[PDB]
Design a protein around this ligand. Structure first.
Ligand code: W3F
Length: 503
């Protein structure tokens, strides 16, 4: 449902308006041709026009398909890539990958196959595109077109930008509505935080802490920040919308209570990947409980409510007794200096509760005081049933290890140690992260499961930073605004908006 005149709102500026952008945008190849979705497409599009560069994009694509190919069909896709790209006589022959790099790849196919066979060649390819092709793209009309998209990205975000619909959600410091971008017609979920309620509780450094964490993380399994803007009487965070309901509902209302182990394996795998993306920024979540794991329209999950997340300075530990009764790791209960370890404790709690249908330290049909629930977390060893395979028993107690030093995933290796645990033995993470594994439950689209101070002015300027680059560019692509607006002159000529002769 795009506005009647969304093409005027997203109308490209004339290339002469982007001079200040040209001389401020850092010219990092990985950023401009890969991380940024629209930059990636434009660079790939520039290579479509060159004969010699075309083959290098097709090969990288085919390697991406190989990485997610099943094992029994891996050596199959292996030679298919070889006979097309690594044969000296092929019309699509990769030349910059030296004869002394292909030759090894042949030997690797002569032996067993592995999902990272063409890793060496792929980097040889990227090292080439970094050189002359990238600097050519920088002087092409496609990079000028990229500067135009950046100009639009930078534009101010106001309340007009969106369209408030219904208040779907409620929490502390405000509410959560469902909004829509008028121009692109994409749905989001606002996080409307009342300004007069923040200054009172003085919780300004916690609102900026969450906003800064959300824009820096970009995970398929954590809610993503797309816009941050101020308004009269509120500060808003435009977040990923999740209509599938939370995991608590599905465990106890749709569950046995609980899920089959294989089904819990899927959610655990996606949550583990969520935490891994957070831990890449040395950021601890500290709030893992089922009601904070939401489901989308397809059945995949994201971690939500990062109000308790904090960015841990590297090589340092934090201190904070925060969270929810029953889901606080012992080191948090004791109010000790900890790191990322509470998140792996939480993961243990989640797997156990998904499988068993109740908390490991509080029976579903049990009435116990907070203090007894905590005593168990610190002294009592949880018990398992026949619902857990031996592998599931192992990961849970390894994750529920009282001493955070012997806890799974709390080593210098981190999340990789957990992905290797036999509980995920039948889980191909490459395919999971690529969204190729069908979720075990698909929600229905129609379903329904639910003052005039100056210091305050400086706090808003650091919060209302506007659109977030990667999510904004993805929005443009998803809604097909990019496909429709990214037009050039007929027959590979220069369009008028990119012509500096007549503006
Ligand atoms: C669509 C939809 N989104 C959400 C919530 C979020 C979402 O989407 N991203 C999010 C990202 C972060 C958060 C989040 O910080 N939270 C905590 C508790 C919170 C903190 C402060 C606050 F002030 C409000 C809430 C919440 C959401 C909800 C609650 C619903 N509502 C439903 O799912 C049901 O009505 C339904 C629709 C269809 C079927 O069932």
């Amino acid at each position: 449902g795009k506005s009647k005149k969304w093409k005027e709102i997203l109308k490209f500026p004339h290339i002469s308006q982007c001079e200040d952008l040209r001389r401020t945008i850092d010219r990092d190849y990985c950023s401009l041709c890969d991380k940024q979705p629209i930059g990636r497409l434009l660079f790939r599009q520039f290579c479509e026009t060159r004969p010699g560069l075309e083959c290098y994009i097709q090969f990288l694509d085919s390697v991406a398909e190989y990485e997610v190919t099943p094992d029994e069909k891996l050596g199959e896709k292996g030679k298919e890539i070889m006979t097309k790209y690594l044969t000296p006589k092929s019309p699509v022959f990769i030349a910059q990958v030296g004869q002394d790099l292909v030759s090894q790849t042949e030997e690797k196919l002569l032996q067993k196959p592995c999902k990272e066979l063409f890793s060496a060649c792929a980097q040889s390819v990227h090292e080439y595109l970094r050189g002359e092709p990238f600097h050519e793209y920088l002087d092409s009309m496609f990079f000028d077109r990229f500067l135009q998209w950046k100009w639009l990205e930078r534009q101010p975000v106001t309340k007009n930008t969106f369209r408030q619909y219904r208040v779907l959600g409620k929490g502390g410091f405000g509410e959560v509505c469902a909004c829509q971008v008028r121009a692109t017609g994409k749905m989001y979920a606002c996080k409307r935080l009342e300004k007069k309620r923040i200054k009172k509780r003085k919780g300004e450094s916690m609102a900026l802490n969450e906003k800064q964490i959300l824009e820096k993380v970009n995970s398929q399994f954590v809610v993503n920040l797309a816009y941050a803007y101020e308004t009269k009487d509120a500060l808003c965070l435009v977040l990923t919308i999740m209509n599938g309901g939370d995991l608590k509902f599905h465990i106890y209302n749709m569950g046995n209570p609980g899920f089959e182990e294989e089904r819990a394996l899927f959610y655990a795998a996606e949550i583990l990947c969520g935490l891994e993306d957070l831990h890449r920024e040395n950021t601890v979540y500290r709030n893992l409980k089922p009601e904070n794991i939401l489901l989308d329209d397809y059945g995949h999950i994201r971690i939500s409510d990062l109000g308790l997340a904090v960015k841990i300075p590297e090589g340092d530990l934090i201190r904070g007794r925060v969270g929810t009764v029953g889901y606080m790791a012992p080191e948090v209960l004791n109010n000790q200096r900890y790191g990322l370890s509470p998140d792996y404790w939480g993961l243990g709690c989640l797997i156990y509760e998904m499988i068993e249908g109740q908390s490991p330290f509080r029976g579903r049909k049990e009435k116990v005081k907070r203090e007894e629930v905590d005593r168990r977390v610190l002294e009592t060893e949880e018990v398992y049933s026949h619902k857990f395979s031996e592998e599931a028993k192992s990961i849970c107690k390894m994750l529920l290890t009282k001493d955070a030093k012997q806890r799974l995933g709390c080593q210098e290796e981190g999340a990789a140690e957990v992905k290797r645990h036999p509980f995920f033995r039948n889980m191909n993470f490459k395919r999971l992260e690529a969204g190729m594994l069908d979720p075990p439950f698909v929600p229905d689209p129609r379903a329904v499961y639910c003052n005039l101070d100056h210091t305050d002015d400086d706090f808003y300027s650091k919060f209302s930073t506007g659109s977030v680059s990667i999510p904004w560019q993805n929005e443009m692509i998803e809604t097909e605004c990019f496909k429709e607006l990214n037009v050039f002159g007929p027959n590979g000529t220069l369009p008028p908006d990119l012509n500096r002769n007549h503006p």
